[PDB]
Every structure is written in C-alpha cells, then in structure tokens.
C-alpha cells in the first residue's frame, strides 16, 4: 500500500465524524497511506484541543 501521506487535523476529524465516531488506525493507515504514528500524533492534537473524547 501507500506510505508517508499527510493529512490535516481537520481532515482526520471530518473523517471520524463521517465514520460514525470510529477509527481503526491499522485500517486507516493502510487505506489512506498515513503513517500510524502520524495518525496518533494528529489524534493527540485533537484530544489536547478538547475536540475529541477518545475511547477503547
């Protein structure tokens, strides 16, 4: 699959909302080509801005 693709926090948040508040980091990294640690990094920034409440 694809590697080192970059997305914005807004794109990830929009994806999450559109995906019913669900994110499979493995699947997402595979399909959209974003590194797993980059997805984690973006989630942390969303969490620290109080924009998302992470579960499971």
């Amino acid at each position: 699959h694809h590697h080192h693709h970059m997305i914005t926090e807004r794109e990830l948040l929009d994806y999450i909302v559109n995906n019913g508040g669900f994110l499979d980091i493995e699947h997402f990294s595979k399909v959209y080509g974003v590194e797993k640690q980059e997805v984690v990094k973006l989630l942390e920034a969303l969490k620290n801005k109080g924009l998302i409440a992470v579960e499971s």
Binding site: L13, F22, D24, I25, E26, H27, L43, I52, A53, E55
Partner: peptide
C-alpha cells in the same frame, strides 16, 4: 470550550 466528539479508536499498536 467545544463539546468533545466521542471517538472509539482501535488497533493503535
């Protein structure tokens, strides 16, 4: 202060 959107996140490791 935004209302936090709930997100279930899996397969993080």
């Amino acid at each position: 202060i935004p209302l936090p959107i709930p997100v279930k996140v899996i397969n993080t490791l």
